[PDB]
Amino acid sequence: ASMQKLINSVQNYAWGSKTALTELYGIANPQQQPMAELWMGAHPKSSSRITTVSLRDAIEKNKTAMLGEAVANRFGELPFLFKVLCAAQPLSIQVHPNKRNSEIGFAKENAAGIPMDAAERNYKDPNHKPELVFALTPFLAMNAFREFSDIVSLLQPVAGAHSAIAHFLQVPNAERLSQLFASLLNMQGEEKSRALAVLKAALNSQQGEPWQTIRVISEYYPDDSGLFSPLLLNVVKLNPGEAMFLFAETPAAYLQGVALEVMANSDNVLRAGLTPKYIDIPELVANVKFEPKPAGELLTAPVKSGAELDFPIPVDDFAFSLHDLALQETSIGQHSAAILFCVEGEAVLRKDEQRLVLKPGESAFIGADESPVNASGTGRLARVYNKL
Numbered sequence: 001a002s003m004q005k006l007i008n009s010v011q012n013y014a015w016g017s018k019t020a021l022t023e024l025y026g027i028a029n030p031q032q033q034p035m036a037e038l039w040m041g042a043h044p045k046s047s048s049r050i051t052t053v054s055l056r057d058a059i060e061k062n063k064t065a066m067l068g069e070a071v072a073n074r075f076g077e078l079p080f081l082f083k084v085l086c087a088a089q090p091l092s093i094q095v096h097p098n099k100r101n102s103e104i105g106f107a108k109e110n111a112a113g114i115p116m117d118a119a120e121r122n123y124k125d126p127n128h129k130p131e132l133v134f135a136l137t138p139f140l141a142m143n144a145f146r147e148f149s150d151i152v153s154l155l156q157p158v159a160g161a162h163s164a165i166a167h168f169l170q171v172p173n174a175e176r177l178s179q180l181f182a183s184l185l186n187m188q189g190e191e192k193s194r195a196l197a198v199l200k201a202a203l204n205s206q207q208g209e210p211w212q213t214i215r216v217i218s219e220y221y222p223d224d225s226g227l228f229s230p231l232l233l234n235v236v237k238l239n240p241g242e243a244m245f246l247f248a249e250t251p252a253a254y255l256q257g258v259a260l261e262v263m264a265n266s267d268n269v270l271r272a273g274l275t276p277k278y279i280d281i282p283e284l285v286a287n288v289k290f291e292p293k294p295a296g297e298l299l300t301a302p303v304k305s306g307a308e309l310d311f312p313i314p315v316d317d318f319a320f321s322l323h324d325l326a327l328q329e330t331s332i333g334q335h336s337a338a339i340l341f342c343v344e345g346e347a348v349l350r351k352d353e354q355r356l357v358l359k360p361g362e363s364a365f366i367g368a369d370e371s372p373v374n375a376s377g378t379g380r381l382a383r384v385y386n387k388l
Contacts (some may be wrong), residue, residue: 002351002370004050004058006339006363011037011046017088020258024136025361038084040339040363040384042077043265045117048365055365059337068336068368070388080318082339082384083261084136084361090217090255092275093142093226093233097287098248099128102268119277122269129264129317131246132300134382135238136343139257140213142233144250144293148172151292154231157206161198161228162187174290181232182285184225185273192225199227210235216255217274226273229253234295243300243311243320249289260341262313262320262384306330316388323381333372336386340364345379 010021016036021027029035040048042056050058059066059078071079097105105123114121133139145151152172155165164183168176187195200218203211210230218227233251238244238259246252251272270284271277302311302322307330309322323332325347332340340349342358349356349364351373356364358381366373375381 002354002367003349003356003373004055004365004367005356005358006040006055006365007049007052008363009039009046009048010035011039013037015087015089015091017086017258020086020088020137021084021361024258026359027361034088036086037261038086038361040082040084040341041080041265043081048363050365065369066337066367068386068388071336071368071386074316074388077265078337079264079386080384081263081265082341082363083263084258085133085254085261086258087139087254087256089220090274091253092271092277093229093251093253093273095251095270095272095284095288096128096131096246096248097123097268097270101287102126102128105268125264125266125268128248128268129315130248130313131261131263131267132243132311132313132318132320133238133246133254134243134260134262134311134320135240135257136260137240137258139238139240139259140216140255141236141238141244141257142213142230142251142253142255143236143244143298144234144247144252145177145232145290146234147292147294148177151177151232154210157202158198158228158231161195162191177232178285178288178290181288181290182281184228185279185281185284187225192223195225196223196227213255221274224274226253226275229273234293234298236295236298238299241322243302244298245300245313247293249287250293251288260343260382262318264317316386319385319387321383321385323375323383325375325377325379325381327376327378329374329376331372332375332381332383334366334368334383334385334387335371336368336388338366338371338383338385340366340373340375341382341384343380343382346377347375347379347381348377350374350376
């Protein structure tokens with residue numbers, strides 16, 4: 001009644017793990033389909049359900065009661081989508097355009113009648129909202145350009161791969177990094193073969209990172225210019241419990257591991273490597289900020305208050321927090337809708353006389369009108385909500 005145990009959709013994309021969700025959370029998979037994403041939210045294409053009715057429909061009927069006044073007024077819907085992402089294969093490198101360009105791209109595609117579900121559709125929102133990724137198992141990824149001196153150092157053993165690399169080495173700056181980035185992506189035929197050969201040779205003469213990451217990617221993307229991108233972008237291996245923001249105009253890729261993912265329901269994606277799909281390179285370059293981001297600034301620094309561990313997000317759309325469960329009840333309240341997810345151990349949620357048990361991988365939806373709820377047990381409980 002007050003606490004709705006969620007029935008969640010599993011997107012079976014080809015790149016998904018066949019065993020990850022089953023091993024971690026005991027979720028059934030007898031056909032051994034690749035389970036890529038567990039969706040917790042009210043996305044129109046595949047909303048979570050409550051005991052069954054659609055959560056989206058449940059929210060539609062009583063928005064102010066379910067979402068709260070603040071969220072209803074600001075967004076008019078559940079403003080976030082909460083996912084468990086299981087990367088068995090490396091995914092494409094993606095850029096999320098900024099607000100200004102997101103409006104134009106969104107408008108451009110709408111002006112040409114491009115449907116929202118079409119494969120050509122890159123822009124599905126007239127705004128940039130950030131994305132938080134939170135590691136559940138060791139999570140390999142790429143995020144943002146390295147310091148120019150770091151890129152210089154890493155490009156030395158493959159200087160002869162392409163003239164644009166040599167060009168960047170002469171003057172390591174933003175505009176030549178942009179030229180390098182675009183030229184790499186635009187390599188064709190024997191220009192591509194020559195460059196790749198030089199890289200594959202360097203793999204045998206270089207050790208450690210990011211050369212090991214290139215080897216891991218090359219199994220799935222052997223004939224792809226994106227194999228050079230770990231030399232340009234920071235390779236990050238998040239330990240369980242660490243988190244990362246996806247920034248606008250900043251190339252990033254999820255390579256392997258299991259992680260929680262909070263985002264806005266609609267997303268804008270320009271592919272930037274590790275993909276068979278066509279890439280509009282001028283549009284990509286126009287939507288990329290070629291400014292180095294040091295490794296220290298990649299991880300989101302959380303804030304611990306009591307048993308709550310908040311990961312501050314620079315926008316009101318969604319908030320993320322971990323709650324260390326104890327045997328004594330602690331109150332988990334909010335002025336908005338919340339989705340509670342049991343990360344590990346076990347979570348007993350209580351609202352008056354109602355009790356709801358959540359084993360790892362299970363989740364519950366708490367409406368704004370049913371806050372607060374008392375949580376006890378062991379392990380950690382993850383919450384997505386709004387600080388409004």
